[PDB]
Design a protein around this motif. Sequence first.
Motif, PDB file in Angstrom:
ATOM      1  N   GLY A   1      45.512  15.470 -24.404  1.00 25.09           N
ATOM      2  CA  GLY A   1      44.067  15.535 -24.703  1.00 25.09           C
ATOM      3  C   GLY A   1      43.110  14.948 -23.673  1.00 25.09           C
ATOM      4  N   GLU A   2      43.630  14.231 -22.681  1.00 23.12           N
ATOM      5  CA  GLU A   2      42.775  13.538 -21.717  1.00 23.12           C
ATOM      6  C   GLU A   2      42.212  14.451 -20.631  1.00 23.12           C
ATOM      7  OE1 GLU A   2      42.464  10.540 -23.860  1.00 23.12           O
ATOM      8  OE2 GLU A   2      41.690  10.232 -21.843  1.00 23.12           O
ATOM      9  N   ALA A   3      43.021  15.394 -20.157  1.00 24.62           N
ATOM     10  CA  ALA A   3      42.552  16.389 -19.204  1.00 24.62           C
ATOM     11  C   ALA A   3      41.477  17.247 -19.864  1.00 24.62           C
ATOM     12  CB  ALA A   3      43.708  17.261 -18.714  1.00 24.62           C
ATOM     13  N   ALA A   4      41.732  17.643 -21.108  1.00 23.90           N
ATOM     14  CA  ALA A   4      40.769  18.392 -21.914  1.00 23.90           C
ATOM     15  C   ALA A   4      39.343  17.795 -21.886  1.00 23.90           C
ATOM     16  CB  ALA A   4      41.268  18.493 -23.354  1.00 23.90           C
ATOM     17  N   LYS A   5      39.234  16.473 -22.050  1.00 26.42           N
ATOM     18  CA  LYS A   5      37.929  15.795 -22.039  1.00 26.42           C
ATOM     19  C   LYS A   5      37.202  16.003 -20.714  1.00 26.42           C
ATOM     20  CE  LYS A   5      39.544  12.267 -25.285  1.00 26.42           C
ATOM     21  NZ  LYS A   5      40.101  10.874 -25.449  1.00 26.42           N
ATOM     22  N   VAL A   6      37.946  15.968 -19.613  1.00 25.44           N
ATOM     23  CA  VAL A   6      37.365  16.178 -18.295  1.00 25.44           C
ATOM     24  C   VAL A   6      36.837  17.603 -18.127  1.00 25.44           C
ATOM     25  CG1 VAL A   6      37.842  16.290 -15.816  1.00 25.44           C
ATOM     26  CG2 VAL A   6      38.728  14.387 -17.173  1.00 25.44           C
ATOM     27  N   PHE A   7      37.634  18.588 -18.510  1.00 29.24           N
ATOM     28  CA  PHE A   7      37.310  19.979 -18.214  1.00 29.24           C
ATOM     29  C   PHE A   7      36.378  20.641 -19.236  1.00 29.24           C
ATOM     30  CE2 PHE A   7      39.433  20.035 -14.391  1.00 29.24           C
ATOM     31  CZ  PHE A   7      40.661  19.413 -14.508  1.00 29.24           C
ATOM     32  N   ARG A   8      36.362  20.116 -20.458  1.00 34.15           N
ATOM     33  CA  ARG A   8      35.386  20.523 -21.464  1.00 34.15           C
ATOM     34  C   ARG A   8      33.982  20.031 -21.066  1.00 34.15           C
ATOM     35  NH1 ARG A   8      34.140  24.450 -23.615  1.00 34.15           N
ATOM     36  NH2 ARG A   8      36.335  24.660 -24.254  1.00 34.15           N
ATOM     37  N   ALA A   9      33.905  18.795 -20.582  1.00 30.22           N
ATOM     38  CA  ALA A   9      32.640  18.241 -20.118  1.00 30.22           C
ATOM     39  C   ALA A   9      32.057  19.096 -18.990  1.00 30.22           C
ATOM     40  CB  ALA A   9      32.820  16.812 -19.661  1.00 30.22           C
ATOM     41  N   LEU A  10      32.869  19.387 -17.977  1.00 35.14           N
ATOM     42  CA  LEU A  10      32.440  20.251 -16.880  1.00 35.14           C
ATOM     43  C   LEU A  10      32.056  21.630 -17.421  1.00 35.14           C
ATOM     44  CD1 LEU A  10      35.259  19.226 -14.342  1.00 35.14           C
ATOM     45  CD2 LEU A  10      32.824  18.677 -14.114  1.00 35.14           C
ATOM     46  N   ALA A  11      32.876  22.163 -18.321  1.00 32.87           N
ATOM     47  CA  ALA A  11      32.618  23.474 -18.914  1.00 32.87           C
ATOM     48  C   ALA A  11      31.270  23.526 -19.650  1.00 32.87           C
ATOM     49  CB  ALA A  11      33.747  23.858 -19.850  1.00 32.87           C
ATOM     50  N   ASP A  12      31.003  22.537 -20.505  1.00 31.10           N
ATOM     51  CA  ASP A  12      29.742  22.490 -21.266  1.00 31.10           C
ATOM     52  C   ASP A  12      28.518  22.478 -20.343  1.00 31.10           C
ATOM     53  OD1 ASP A  12      31.048  22.580 -23.765  1.00 31.10           O
ATOM     54  OD2 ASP A  12      30.954  20.409 -24.057  1.00 31.10           O
ATOM     55  N   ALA A  13      28.655  21.840 -19.179  1.00 28.63           N
ATOM     56  CA  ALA A  13      27.619  21.856 -18.138  1.00 28.63           C
ATOM     57  C   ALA A  13      27.639  23.149 -17.300  1.00 28.63           C
ATOM     58  CB  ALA A  13      27.769  20.635 -17.234  1.00 28.63           C
ATOM     59  N   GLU A  14      28.469  24.108 -17.713  1.00 29.19           N
ATOM     60  CA  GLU A  14      28.596  25.423 -17.070  1.00 29.19           C
ATOM     61  C   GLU A  14      28.947  25.342 -15.578  1.00 29.19           C
ATOM     62  OE1 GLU A  14      25.147  25.983 -19.386  1.00 29.19           O
ATOM     63  OE2 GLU A  14      25.577  28.090 -19.870  1.00 29.19           O
ATOM     64  N   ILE A  15      29.711  24.310 -15.214  1.00 27.12           N
ATOM     65  CA  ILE A  15      30.228  24.145 -13.854  1.00 27.12           C
ATOM     66  C   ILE A  15      31.543  24.910 -13.695  1.00 27.12           C
ATOM     67  CG2 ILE A  15      31.073  22.552 -12.103  1.00 27.12           C
ATOM     68  CD1 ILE A  15      28.273  22.019 -12.548  1.00 27.12           C
ATOM     69  N   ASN A  16      31.580  25.816 -12.719  1.00 22.65           N
ATOM     70  CA  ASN A  16      32.749  26.651 -12.438  1.00 22.65           C
ATOM     71  C   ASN A  16      33.562  25.985 -11.339  1.00 22.65           C
ATOM     72  OD1 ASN A  16      34.071  29.319 -12.950  1.00 22.65           O
ATOM     73  ND2 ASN A  16      33.673  29.626 -10.756  1.00 22.65           N
ATOM     74  N   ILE A  17      34.836  25.698 -11.611  1.00 27.04           N
ATOM     75  CA  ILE A  17      35.689  24.994 -10.645  1.00 27.04           C
ATOM     76  C   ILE A  17      36.809  25.897 -10.141  1.00 27.04           C
ATOM     77  CG2 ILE A  17      35.150  22.816 -11.828  1.00 27.04           C
ATOM     78  CD1 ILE A  17      37.967  22.720 -12.863  1.00 27.04           C
ATOM     79  N   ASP A  18      37.388  25.532  -9.001  1.00 24.87           N
ATOM     80  CA  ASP A  18      38.543  26.235  -8.456  1.00 24.87           C
ATOM     81  C   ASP A  18      39.801  25.335  -8.532  1.00 24.87           C
ATOM     82  OD1 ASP A  18      39.369  27.807  -5.212  1.00 24.87           O
ATOM     83  OD2 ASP A  18      40.333  27.916  -7.166  1.00 24.87           O
ATOM     84  N   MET A  19      40.057  24.523  -7.506  1.00 24.42           N
ATOM     85  CA  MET A  19      41.313  23.769  -7.420  1.00 24.42           C
ATOM     86  C   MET A  19      41.379  22.685  -8.469  1.00 24.42           C
ATOM     87  SD  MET A  19      41.935  23.210  -3.364  1.00 24.42           S
ATOM     88  CE  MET A  19      43.719  23.220  -3.470  1.00 24.42           C
ATOM     89  N   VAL A  20      42.565  22.493  -9.046  1.00 21.34           N
ATOM     90  CA  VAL A  20      42.870  21.308  -9.853  1.00 21.34           C
ATOM     91  C   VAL A  20      44.231  20.778  -9.441  1.00 21.34           C
ATOM     92  CG1 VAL A  20      43.245  20.347 -12.118  1.00 21.34           C
ATOM     93  CG2 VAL A  20      41.620  22.218 -11.829  1.00 21.34           C
ATOM     94  N   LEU A  21      44.286  19.522  -9.012  1.00 20.47           N
ATOM     95  CA  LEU A  21      45.541  18.882  -8.656  1.00 20.47           C
ATOM     96  C   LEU A  21      45.698  17.611  -9.475  1.00 20.47           C
ATOM     97  CD1 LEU A  21      43.726  19.544  -5.791  1.00 20.47           C
ATOM     98  CD2 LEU A  21      46.047  19.391  -4.836  1.00 20.47           C
ATOM     99  N   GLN A  22      46.842  17.500 -10.149  1.00 20.29           N
ATOM    100  CA  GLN A  22      47.255  16.299 -10.847  1.00 20.29           C
ATOM    101  C   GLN A  22      48.727  16.078 -10.555  1.00 20.29           C
ATOM    102  OE1 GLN A  22      48.558  15.291 -15.247  1.00 20.29           O
ATOM    103  NE2 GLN A  22      46.367  15.831 -15.263  1.00 20.29           N
TER     104      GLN A  22
END
Lengths: 159, 160, 387, 392
Positions: free
Chosen positions: A28-49
């Motif tokens: 659930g922790e990654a979800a919090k990061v990417f939902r926040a970005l999503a709600d702000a309508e920010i489109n991302i490319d690379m994700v590295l973890q």
Amino acid sequence: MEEAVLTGVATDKSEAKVTVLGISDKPGEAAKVFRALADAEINIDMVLQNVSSVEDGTTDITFTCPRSDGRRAMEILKKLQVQGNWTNVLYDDQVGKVSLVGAGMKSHPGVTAEFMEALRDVNVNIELISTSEIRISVLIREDDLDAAARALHEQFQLG
Amino acid sequence: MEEAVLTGVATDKSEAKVTVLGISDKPGEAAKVFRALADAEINIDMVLQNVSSVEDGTTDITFTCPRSDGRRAMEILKKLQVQGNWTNVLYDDQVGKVSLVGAGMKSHPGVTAEFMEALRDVNVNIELISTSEIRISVLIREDDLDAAARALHEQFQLGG
Amino acid sequence: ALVVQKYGGSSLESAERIRNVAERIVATKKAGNDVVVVCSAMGDTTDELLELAAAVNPVPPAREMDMLLTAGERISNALVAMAIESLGAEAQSFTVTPGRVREALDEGKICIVAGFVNKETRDVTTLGRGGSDTTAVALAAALNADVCEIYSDVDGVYTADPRIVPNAQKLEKLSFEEMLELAAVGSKILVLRSVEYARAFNVPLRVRSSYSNDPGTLIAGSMEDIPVEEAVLTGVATDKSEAKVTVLGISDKPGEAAKVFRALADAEINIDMVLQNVSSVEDGTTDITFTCPRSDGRRAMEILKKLQVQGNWTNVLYDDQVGKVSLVGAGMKSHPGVTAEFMEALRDVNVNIELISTSEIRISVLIREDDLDAAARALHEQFQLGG
Amino acid sequence: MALVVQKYGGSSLESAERIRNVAERIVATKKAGNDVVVVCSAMGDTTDELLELAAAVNPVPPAREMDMLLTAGERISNALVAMAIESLGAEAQSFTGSQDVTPGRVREALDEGKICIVAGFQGVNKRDVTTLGRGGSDTTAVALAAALNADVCEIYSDVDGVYTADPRIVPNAQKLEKLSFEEMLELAAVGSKILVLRSVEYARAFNVPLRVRSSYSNDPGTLIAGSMEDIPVEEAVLTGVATDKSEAKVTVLGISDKPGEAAKVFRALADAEINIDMVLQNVSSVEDGTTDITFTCPRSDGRRAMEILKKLQVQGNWTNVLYDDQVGKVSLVGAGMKSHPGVTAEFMEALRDVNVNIELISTSEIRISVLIREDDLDAAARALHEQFQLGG
Ligand SMILES: N[C@@H](CCCC[NH3+])C(=O)O
Ligand SMILES: N[C@@H](CCCC[NH3+])C(=O)O
Ligand SMILES: N[C@@H](CCCC[NH3+])C(=O)O
Ligand SMILES: C[C@@H](O)[C@H](N)C(=O)O
Ligand SMILES: C[C@@H](O)[C@H](N)C(=O)O
Ligand SMILES: C[C@@H](O)[C@H](N)C(=O)O
Ligand SMILES: C[C@@H](O)[C@H](N)C(=O)O
């Protein structure tokens, strides 16, 4: 068979990288990061973890997005820093990306090895790495793009 | 795979054939014929014996030998004729032999068929046949020899 | 010093045996020989491929059949090449002129040749697909090799079958013609066509095992060139794989034998040992006997029976429990009494002789198949072929 | 005209019966008014058996003899399919080697109405690219399709299409009707082994449409065609989910973030011929100035990978080398995730809601891949498939 093709070298400097440092490795922790970005309508490319450390069960999540959305993304995430017990959120709008594009490169580890070796020999430091069977991507200082691209062209005889 | 060669055609007119008619088809009977020929030190070449008939239980035995020995051979056998066995002994000093020489001919029965067909088409009659994987031989009249050779050379594209 | 080595399927059944053969090849090179290698498909592949062929197309066309069998052969050749290369020899594969092999031989390379239409003379007529045996002797001929070695699990040519005749002996040597005759009336260690090629070019052949180091049997020299006093009897051969068919009452006039053998050729009956004796003056008729494989026996009878009912002859007989025994030897050409002793030998073990056929150095007879062991044994000891 | 090249895999040509069936399919394609070029893999599992023989007779088989060995295997199929086709009334013409087969010789033969069987064609490249390894039957089929400007290149096997997920694991998984070249490469990079990657790359380079279909049915299969760039933004979608549990996860802890260090790891791995993938390295710490490098390799190679890297731990200055062989990989691919926010969010949420922990994340422009416990794979695949409403 073990057949492969190396088709070219790509460069880019249109992105920023943001890193969430010390996010806890549980569901659930990654979800919090990417939902926040999503709600702000920010489109991302690379994700590295990469994998979390045994010592404190945390890891880092880096992502890339267009330079014009970077600060805003890094500011959306700061309102999650204390909740998630993160260490910090880094920002960097001077990152360059160089890739070797191809297909079937898993069966030829020499390519990956030679990719790294080429950049060593032109004194370029590899900061991030993300590879696949069809693309070997690294993130570096934008000022090293030309030299990296050139070193790759020679090494693999593309251009 | 099932490969063969047809190498050439050979003729000969050096022989006579002698035929012992109506010998009993039981052990020891062929031995009597060829032991007699052996004791006279007559060297033979071709021996031909087909299966005995159901009615009589007898066959004929034909052999070839140098043409000069043929008459003596026929007389030696005639001495033992009907003498507890056969019906007649024949002698023929005008017999010719023509042969298709090669290797592996079993797996191509068309070669044997075509051999016979070649001699038919030049109207040569085949009196005896004896064949193997490496040689198809027949005995005919010595006069027909040249026509036979010619026909076989043309049929199998050997040329001589 | 030029050696051609051919290796059969049995010699190349597995990776272990391919490597063993490769070291054998390299040893031959090391011993101071230039070496050319020819390989059959790996044990049994050929038979499996022929069976696929027939299943995908009855009457497979020759072009694709050659393509098919050559692929099988190429598998072995690639593997043997790899194995040689691993033991330090430089390999060169050919898919192909004598000169190109010679060039490669002169650079020290072991040449592996898969296959080439191989004709001795422009006039001879060739039938079927060139196999491994004949490409091996053809290469040996063209490159003028000192010996053409034929490797298998067979380690020589014997005076009789050793499991039946306990006094059977491996032959030291025999002539082409003598080998041609033995192979004509018995099991084929080599393909007949290939031996005939050898004879035409005077290429010595050596039959030997790839499992031991026994030097095997040499097949060399023509029978003509052996003096009469040296001429010996070579061996005895048996066969129980054939049926015999007799056409009774064929009229002795041109064209009648043609009717019989055209009918058989069109049905593809692999006929052999055709025999016809003189016609009876009374009837103007004779009989024609031949042998064929027992599997073909049925169709041969069905074909000839149709023609019988058309009235071309009196009867057609079928016999599938017949065996043949033969004696071969250059020694019988010029010495009277060999035939007498042959017939006497079988008389003395009370074996009845049903049919007799001949070449100048061979006596063959047909008997009941159950009498074969007795006959072979009697002949072998009567002519003292190893005891 | 209407030029169709057809490649048939080992599964399609495993027996005489199947070769005759295929032959009739080849001839039917001719009869429907098409010129037809055919490429055959070796029958059944021949290639695997030959490769096993090769390694057993020479531990490092030369490239030349290997090409000869493999080509022989293919020629067997070619000969058989040629025979079957001739029995059905077609006129077969067989070609070999890259130019022998020039496209011109094939065009000439096709113009005479011949069905052309071809082997060994990597192109008539007189395309600045670097080629590695031996070109297989898939590649020669698409190369021929490129060279002759075929209307389609059909890849036949027992696989009747490309699906939205493994239908064994997710019931609602369904056959895709079509997808782009880039979407196919991404799927095939992370699980789907229905086509050789290099052959698909070739396909997109020369814009040759591909059809993945079955030789056991008449189903038209899945079309692979068009660049992902040429898809309109509004109708770009998520195409499928793929899984993999064939790999191990190795992690090098504490590498100095200075030039040449990545090279020390991957040179060592390359010399041992360890087939590495999914290399992943995030930013260094700045306190310690070190980072970690993780990669995957086949599970069979893991022990060797670890032996090599452990020796370099002692000599070099890394902190540790970790090994993990119960890891699984689940991925989501789709042109629709480019330029659409919230795809990454929905992916992570999906896994969260079935209590699956995301251990590692990697991506392409149109792909999200994560490593998880292998025991969580089925649940992950279902959850992602359901979340994105793939295949109805
Ligand atoms: N652009 C999509 C997917 C990003 C991951 C693949 N590059 C998003 O922002 O959610
Ligand atoms: N010439 C020998 C052998 C004859 C049988 C073979 N042609 C003999 O008179 O006994
Ligand atoms: N492309 C490989 C394999 C094809 C798929 C499996 N039969 C070849 O050379 O045949
Ligand atoms: C670190 C982050 O990926 C976490 N494991 C999650 O599942 O959300
Ligand atoms: C006819 C003759 O050959 C007889 N059968 C024998 O054995 O002597
Ligand atoms: C009986 C058969 O040989 C016949 N004389 C012919 O020439 O055809
Ligand atoms: C850590 C590793 O990527 C290092 N920076 C290198 O370039 O080799």
